[PDB]
Structures are given as structure tokens and as C-alpha cells.
Amino acid sequence: RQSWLPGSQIPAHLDTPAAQALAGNFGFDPLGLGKDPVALRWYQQAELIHCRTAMAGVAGILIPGLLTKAGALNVPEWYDAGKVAIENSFAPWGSLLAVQLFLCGFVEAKRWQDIRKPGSQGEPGSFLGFEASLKGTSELGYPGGPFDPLGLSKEADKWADWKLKEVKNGRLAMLAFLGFVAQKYATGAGPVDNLAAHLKDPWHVNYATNGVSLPFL
């Protein structure tokens, strides 16, 4: 049994056969937020959405930032890309956010309805024939049809491992974005610049030297 703390008392709610079926089960729940099975299922969906969203965002911040350091691209910093992208644009940020909220609300409402009732999106005569493809697999949060065009989820032997590479990576991405924010309020530069400045002198450039992360020192 893999654990996040060797010797710590693993919670009973995380030891059930249903809880162990989730990917990345390391028995980490010191606050007991997953005692309720309904709450655990909802939080599992939230963790999956956060993992995918954080992975896409951190990728869109790290890859163009790494290409900017080289001569591949000239993408500005993530904390300044919004202003630069809205300057020479075709619409203000308010109109764009309104269209975004509408388009995101529709799909999130459909996802919410499928979470409330699995496979309910396949109601006949409701999506111009595309309702059949809107029914996900047996596991919540893992749909097929239009999603997953390559069909890599049909092989079960790697499926259980595939999900492990999706949650864990996502968790890392979730911390990555957090660092991106903290570093922004601690050094004032970008993440790639902070990485290079740290690699230049690791013994004197860290969180214990900026004076912000350790005010008592």
C-alpha cells in the first residue's frame, strides 16, 4: 500500500474498495474532506478538472516562456500577456469574457448534468443526433466519443497506468501555477528567469534570500 507518510494512520474512508479505485491514492486526507462518498466523488471530479486545467495553463506558460528564452518565440510574460494580447485585438476584454462565460457555461452545465446523472446526456432527440456520443464511460470524468479521438483508452492494461500519469502530472501542474504566482509576488520576474537566476547561484538565490518568504530572517 503506497502512502504519503510511512507509518501514518491511513483514513478508513480512503481504504474502501471504491476509494482505492481512484488514480493516485496515497491515503492523504488529514482534514477528512473525503469521508462522505458523495463528497469524495465530487472532489474527485474537481481534482480531475483542476488537473487538466492546471496542466493546460502551466503548459501555455512554461513552453512559450522557454521558447522566448531562446530564439524560437517572443511571447511576453504570463503576467503581462493579457495586456499585450488585448492591446492589438479585435474586441475588449469585457466582450471576450462575456462570450467566454456563455460558451463555458453551456459545456459546464452539460458536464454538471452528467455528473448528477451518469449517461443522462444521451437523451434521444436532444442534441441533433450527437447525444449518443455525449455518454461517457463507466467511470465519471472519463468520457469518450468526441473526446479522445485517438482511442487510447480502449486498452485496459495501460488504462490504469494512463490515469496515474494524468492525475500526478496534474497535481504537479497545480503546484507549478501556485509557484508561478508566489514567485511573481516574491522576485518580480518570470518563472524561467527565476529558474535561470537560481541556476546561476543556488546557494544565495532562493526563497530564504528574497526577504519576503522569511520575514523573521
Partner: protein, 165 residues
């Protein structure tokens, strides 16, 4: 600006009040020596006064005709004119700590309620269980919302005692 008030960084009464406080402190300081404990204490108080006035003017507070700051309690005005730090953020901070303490106490009561003698657990606090619940109460809003959605937060009408009407 809002309600006919002016910012503390541009109020004459605010500066006059600061000069009055510094004047009375300096007047009290002139009666002592230079390398004595009361003089150092008075200088420290004066530095604290200067830092307090500078910080209040730096925060963008709105002062009145008396030179004293004013708080904005309307959420719209606070979030629209940069006054959310006065009454909005501390409101949510107190809500978090209040629900935190309430949830910890409720969890302790429900936990000791099923034991043999709950009154002993009430007069003599079970420090290990109380400490565990105190550390676990960080997720109080999530646990409270999940409890409310499940219907286990409230007790039924038939299980509560009432008057004979």
C-alpha cells in the same frame, strides 16, 4: 469622493492632528535627557506614531472633516473605489474563524455525545480528540456545505422538545 469625504493623504486636518500628537510627544520628551530610558521610550512612541500615520495615508483611507479615517461598509463602494480592505476582507476573515471555532466545538460535542458519560468529557476536556478536531477544522466551510447538502446538519422536528403550546 465618497460621501463628501477626502483621502487622508490630502486632508489638512489629518496632518494637523499628526502634528498635534507629535508636538505633545516632543513637548513631553524635552523634559528628559538624551541617553535615558524615558527618552528612548518617547522616541520609540514618536516613531510608532509617524509609521502609523504614514501607513494609514498609504493605505488610501478616506478621512472626514475631523481628520480621522472612515470605513466603507458597502461592498460595491469598497470593491469599486479600492476600499475592500476596511470592511469586506476582515468580514470574510471573521466568518472563516467563527465557523472554524463553531465547527470544532460542534464536532467535539457530537463526538463525545455517543460515549458513556458525555458530561465528564464536557467538564474535563479530552485534549487528544479536541486537538485532532482543532487541526481538522481547516476545511470547515467544505464540511459544513457537504453536511447541509446531505441533510445531516439539522435535526428533525419530531426529535426536538417543545412547549405544550
Amino acid at each position: 469622493d465618497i460621501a463628501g469625504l477626502t483621502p487622508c493623504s490630502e486632508s489638512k486636518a489629518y496632518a494637523k492632528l499628526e502634528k498635534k500628537e507629535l508636538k505633545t510627544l516632543e513637548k513631553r520628551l524635552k523634559q528628559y535627557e538624551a541617553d535615558s530610558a524615558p527618552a528612548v521610550a518617547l522616541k520609540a512612541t514618536m516613531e510608532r506614531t509617524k509609521a502609523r500615520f504614514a501607513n494609514y495615508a498609504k493605505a488610501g483611507l478616506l478621512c472626514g472633516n475631523d481628520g480621522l479615517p472612515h470605513l466603507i461598509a458597502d461592498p460595491g463602494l469598497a470593491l469599486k473605489y479600492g476600499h475592500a480592505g476596511e470592511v469586506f476582507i476582515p468580514t470574510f476573515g471573521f466568518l472563516y474563524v467563527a465557523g472554524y471555532i463553531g465547527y470544532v466545538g460542534r464536532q467535539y460535542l457530537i463526538a463525545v455525545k455517543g460515549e458513556a458519560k458525555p458530561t465528564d468529557k464536557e467538564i474535563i476536556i479530552d485534549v487528544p480528540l479536541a486537538t485532532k478536531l482543532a487541526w481538522q477544522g481547516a476545511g470547515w466551510p467544505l464540511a459544513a456545505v457537504q453536511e447541509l447538502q446531505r441533510g445531516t446538519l439539522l435535526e428533525k422536528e419530531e426529535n426536538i422538545t417543545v412547549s405544550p403550546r
